[PDB]
Design an enzyme around this catalytic site. Sequence first.
Site, PDB file in Angstrom:
ATOM      1  N   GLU A 167       0.830  -1.196   0.000  1.00  6.19           N
ATOM      2  CA  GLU A 167       0.000   0.000   0.000  1.00  6.19           C
ATOM      3  C   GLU A 167       0.862   1.241   0.000  1.00  6.19           C
ATOM      4  O   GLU A 167       0.647   2.135  -0.820  1.00  6.19           O
ATOM      5  CB  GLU A 167      -0.919   0.020   1.227  1.00  6.19           C
ATOM      6  CG  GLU A 167      -2.013  -1.044   1.246  1.00  6.19           C
ATOM      7  CD  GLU A 167      -3.218  -0.729   0.420  1.00  6.19           C
ATOM      8  OE1 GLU A 167      -3.313   0.392  -0.117  1.00  6.19           O
ATOM      9  OE2 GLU A 167      -4.078  -1.621   0.309  1.00  6.19           O
TER      10      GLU A 167
ATOM     11  N   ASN B 185      -8.435   9.031  -4.557  1.00  6.00           N
ATOM     12  CA  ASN B 185      -9.358   8.094  -5.157  1.00  6.00           C
ATOM     13  C   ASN B 185     -10.241   8.785  -6.190  1.00  6.00           C
ATOM     14  O   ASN B 185     -10.342  10.009  -6.261  1.00  6.00           O
ATOM     15  CB  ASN B 185     -10.212   7.431  -4.081  1.00  6.00           C
ATOM     16  CG  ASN B 185      -9.379   6.660  -3.077  1.00  6.00           C
ATOM     17  OD1 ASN B 185      -9.232   7.069  -1.925  1.00  6.00           O
ATOM     18  ND2 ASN B 185      -8.836   5.526  -3.507  1.00  6.00           N
TER      19      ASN B 185
ATOM     20  N   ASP C   6     -13.551   8.859  -6.392  1.00  8.94           N
ATOM     21  CA  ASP C   6     -14.703   9.522  -5.796  1.00  8.94           C
ATOM     22  C   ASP C   6     -14.361  10.821  -5.058  1.00  8.94           C
ATOM     23  O   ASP C   6     -15.261  11.436  -4.476  1.00  8.94           O
ATOM     24  CB  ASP C   6     -15.381   8.554  -4.830  1.00  8.94           C
ATOM     25  CG  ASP C   6     -14.465   8.148  -3.692  1.00  8.94           C
ATOM     26  OD1 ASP C   6     -13.303   8.604  -3.674  1.00  8.94           O
ATOM     27  OD2 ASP C   6     -14.875   7.329  -2.834  1.00  8.94           O
TER      28      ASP C   6
ATOM     29  N   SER D 264     -12.140  11.012  -2.471  1.00  7.44           N
ATOM     30  CA  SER D 264     -11.531  10.659  -1.207  1.00  7.44           C
ATOM     31  C   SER D 264     -10.030  10.480  -1.394  1.00  7.44           C
ATOM     32  O   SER D 264      -9.523  10.449  -2.511  1.00  7.44           O
ATOM     33  CB  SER D 264     -12.171   9.391  -0.659  1.00  7.44           C
ATOM     34  OG  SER D 264     -11.877   8.281  -1.482  1.00  7.44           O
TER      35      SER D 264
ATOM     36  N   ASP E 125      -6.445   8.358   0.311  1.00  8.33           N
ATOM     37  CA  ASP E 125      -5.804   7.405   1.203  1.00  8.33           C
ATOM     38  C   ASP E 125      -4.546   8.004   1.823  1.00  8.33           C
ATOM     39  O   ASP E 125      -3.759   8.671   1.147  1.00  8.33           O
ATOM     40  CB  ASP E 125      -5.452   6.118   0.453  1.00  8.33           C
ATOM     41  CG  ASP E 125      -6.658   5.473  -0.168  1.00  8.33           C
ATOM     42  OD1 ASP E 125      -7.765   5.756   0.338  1.00  8.33           O
ATOM     43  OD2 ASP E 125      -6.502   4.662  -1.110  1.00  8.33           O
TER      44      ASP E 125
ATOM     45  N   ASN F  90      -8.665   5.549   4.339  1.00 10.89           N
ATOM     46  CA  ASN F  90      -9.451   6.297   3.363  1.00 10.89           C
ATOM     47  C   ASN F  90     -10.318   7.367   4.026  1.00 10.89           C
ATOM     48  O   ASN F  90     -10.951   7.114   5.051  1.00 10.89           O
ATOM     49  CB  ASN F  90     -10.294   5.304   2.552  1.00 10.89           C
ATOM     50  CG  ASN F  90     -11.264   5.979   1.633  1.00 10.89           C
ATOM     51  OD1 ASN F  90     -12.470   5.937   1.860  1.00 10.89           O
ATOM     52  ND2 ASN F  90     -10.749   6.659   0.624  1.00 10.89           N
TER      53      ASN F  90
ATOM     54  N   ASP G  11     -14.443  -4.400  11.556  1.00 13.15           N
ATOM     55  CA  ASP G  11     -15.758  -3.975  11.101  1.00 13.15           C
ATOM     56  C   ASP G  11     -16.488  -5.040  10.298  1.00 13.15           C
ATOM     57  O   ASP G  11     -17.565  -4.755   9.767  1.00 13.15           O
ATOM     58  CB  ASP G  11     -15.671  -2.661  10.299  1.00 13.15           C
ATOM     59  CG  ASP G  11     -15.090  -2.833   8.890  1.00 13.15           C
ATOM     60  OD1 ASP G  11     -14.698  -3.939   8.482  1.00 13.15           O
ATOM     61  OD2 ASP G  11     -15.054  -1.836   8.149  1.00 13.15           O
TER      62      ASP G  11
END
EC number: 3.2.1.17
Length: 129
Positions: A35, A46, A48, A50, A52, A59, A101
């Site tokens: 990553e 990203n 959209d 957003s 990272d 994110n 989660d």
Amino acid sequence: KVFGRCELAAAMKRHGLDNYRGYSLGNWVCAAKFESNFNTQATNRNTDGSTDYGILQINSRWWCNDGRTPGSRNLCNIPCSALLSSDITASVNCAKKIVSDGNGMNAWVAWRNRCKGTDVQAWIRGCRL
Ligand SMILES: [Cl-]
Ligand SMILES: [Cl-]
């Protein structure tokens, strides 16, 4: 800060990530390398709108606040700049919330596509842990 491989393994172990939610430390070292290449200051945008952030590339649409992802959550309750620190504590604490989660480490694409099903323990081999 650009971590050494065994340095990061040791710092993740200190912060309780070894065998956390059943994930051995290799998986953490592996998802960090692919990553962020161990660089705590890595950021990527990203599609959209957003971003990272940090050594695990967490994110802004869900976990931190960068003030420029309209309508996003702050579920780790931190500013995204805090993930870029040389002190990985904020990244580790948020990452504990993510992996718990429901979807495990599959949240991290580069873990899913480049670590899962691999001999992840190679990533801690040679290290004094
Ligand atoms: Cl391992
Ligand atoms: Cl990938």
